[PDB]
Design a binder for this molecule. Structure first.
Ligand SMILES: Cc1ccc(CNC[C@@H](C)O)s1
Ligand SMILES: Cc1ccc(CNC[C@@H](C)O)s1
Ligand SMILES: [Zn+2]
Ligand SMILES: [Zn+2]
Ligand SMILES: [Zn+2]
Ligand SMILES: [Zn+2]
Lengths: 360, 360
């Protein structure tokens, strides 16, 4: 069986399990079960399943080089699919809640969950909570007797928490740190002194890289009983590198990709986000450019946004991007080589993760 | 040391631990740490700590009848305090998110977290997520080598999930089940056919009783290594009984207690909640009363709310309440006696829980 058809089959299985348990142990009625079914499908399906499929791909890599009974190969692949779905559902949680927090309109060329007429924010906040609860129900059901249960749950929590911390770093990225105060409405930064590479890196490391690259890689290792074929500091380093690069691409596309390809109208400029474009622009701009950026950034006004866009196009950020890219290729290749000392197989999974990130 | 001063001390300890870890492992800066500190205090403190103190009280009960070294007594009490704080922080999560979902104004005579000028919904949704993540960080840190870790985490998740399911039952309680549909804006029920005792009970069982009574009781048992001194079906039954009663009182007070005592302007009528008052009113009203209730319920209009209030006062619901109360006293006393067969001590903790609920 091809990996994707197994992964998709296990979604159906896990969905049936969750909804069946809701009827048999949580007293749910049929119409509410249908609501939850439709919520699950709408929030968890329709992406590329990159994250969850990474778990599967890492596990398949080990299967190719490790002796096992056929029933064991099947069990490991089923565990990798279940684990994959945990990460997809964790993402679904965050996309639901983030869309509500940001007042987003679309995601993947469809309305954000909370905008559906029969959902509303009141229900959608809680739907998002359910989504993350369902990751725990899956783990406890399917991994109840597994030797990796503890490690897997402890890893999952730490990544979830890093993610929520990342979200705080992101939504507060345009405030002056010294002015953060629950008692006082937060003004946008006027100096942009906190739009640095190091600060951008911290946002991205926590908000994105832990759940998108570290967790799929390490969960694949866990469900394969293979954590000892790797130096975990190397896995973290490569994860953080690849994830930062992933984000840099997304930040570029938010500004320059037509809405039809990103599946939304990009608003990073209007939201005054600490994006790779803003940080890199400020790292090369002259005095006058800086002053024009400060008078136009973080404003809904289409004229001011167009001035910000024009500032970025004139500043030749494509050249900064190519240089960033080259350097990432260097460092990622280096880390892949270091990973080969202990696991060729694992190194090749990371290679595949890198090439799917780099090509797109 | 008195129980409450130990419990309060452990809050300070757990807070210091969480914030210190944020600086040492999550790269947090001082001002964001202060924001989180203030968030934690504002959301987790200022109630009666009934839930968390139950954990402590159950543990102290066992300490009085079980032989242990002094260092062991201390460790069990520290575990009970930490476990207590997990449940308080879980509540804090739900109160944050519920207040945002319901557009609430006040809670405990102070503004809801999301209303603070320097918070906003964008940050508050995520603050609420952090609050629940911090329950997991606490458990993994303080209970890492404990034999009850698995059981405690599995119980915690199931209660969290039941709670979120309860929330879905509550916010959808005024819709017709057969009309639930993410695609279609939900109309308020016109027939109120789903305002029954059984349906009310399901909302309350999930939304309230699992986290407020079942989890504190069973966590006390867990941290005491005492789950075998009880029949767990009896613990569940008594929990569900006491919790329903708790909710019935809150539903009565939402309508009739001055805002100064409940710490808010009650809105159950305007929100068209499936409250004990509405269900019990509909269980005794004549045709004309029913028709007047349907023309006035679930409307912001102060005149219509006052008509709903007047309908409840004329219907002598105090007498239905006294009868409900008597019957709960019967059943709770019965369950306490059944609990004595295996643990006098545990039975006496439940007695104390009952008397603190019943007296208030
Ligand atoms: C924690 C997260 C919030 C949003 C995420 C997905 N990244 C693309 C989005 C910003 O459009 S992950
Ligand atoms: C899951 C929960 C939502 C709200 C809760 C606290 N009960 C009083 C409130 C309704 O005013 S628990
Ligand atoms: Zn966001
Ligand atoms: Zn983006
Ligand atoms: Zn509510
Ligand atoms: Zn209430």
């Amino acid at each position: 069986m091809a990996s994707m058809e197994r992964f998709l089959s296990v979604y159906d299985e896990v969905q049936a399990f969750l909804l069946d348990q809701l009827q048999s142990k949580y007293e749910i009625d049929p119409n509410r079960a249908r609501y939850l079914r439709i919520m699950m499908d709408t929030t968890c399906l329709g992406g590329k399943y990159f994250r969850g499929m990474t778990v599967v791909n890492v596990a398949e890599g080990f299967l190719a080089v490790t002796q096992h009974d056929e029933a064991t190969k099947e069990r490991i692949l089923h565990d990798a699919c279940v684990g994959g779905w945990m990460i997809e559902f964790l993402q679904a949680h965050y996309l639901v809640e983030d869309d509500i927090m940001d007042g987003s309109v679309m995601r993947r060329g469809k309305p954000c969950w909370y905008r559906f007429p029969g959902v509303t924010t009141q229900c959608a906040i809680n739907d998002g909570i359910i989504l993350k609860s369902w990751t725990q129900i899956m783990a406890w059901h399917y991994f109840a007797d597994r030797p990796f249960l503890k490690d897997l749950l402890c890893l999952f929590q730490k990544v979830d928490y890093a993610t929520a911390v990342g979200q705080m770093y992101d939504v507060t990225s345009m405030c002056d740190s010294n002015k953060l105060d629950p008692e006082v409405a937060q003004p946008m930064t006027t100096d942009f002194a906190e739009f640095t590479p190091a600060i951008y890196k911290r946002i991205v490391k926590y908000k994105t890289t832990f759940y998108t690259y570290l967790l799929p890689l390490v969960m694949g290792l866990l469900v394969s009983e293979a954590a000892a074929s790797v130096e975990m500091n190397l896995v973290e380093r490569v994860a953080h590198l690849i994830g930062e690069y992933f984000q840099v691409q997304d930040d570029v596309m938010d500004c320059f990709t037509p809405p039809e390809q990103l599946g939304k109208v990009g608003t990073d400029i209007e939201d005054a986000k600490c994006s790779w474009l803003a940080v890199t622009f400020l790292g090369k701009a002259n005095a006058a450019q800086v002053a024009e950026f400060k008078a136009n950034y973080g404003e809904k006004d289409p004229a001011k946004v167009a001035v910000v866009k024009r500032l970025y196009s004139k500043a030749n950020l494509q050249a900064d991007f190519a240089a960033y890219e080259a350097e990432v290729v260097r460092e990622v290749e280096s880390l892949i080589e270091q990973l080969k000392v202990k696991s060729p197989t694992f190194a090749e999974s990371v290679a595949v993760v890198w090439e799917k990130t780099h090509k797109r």
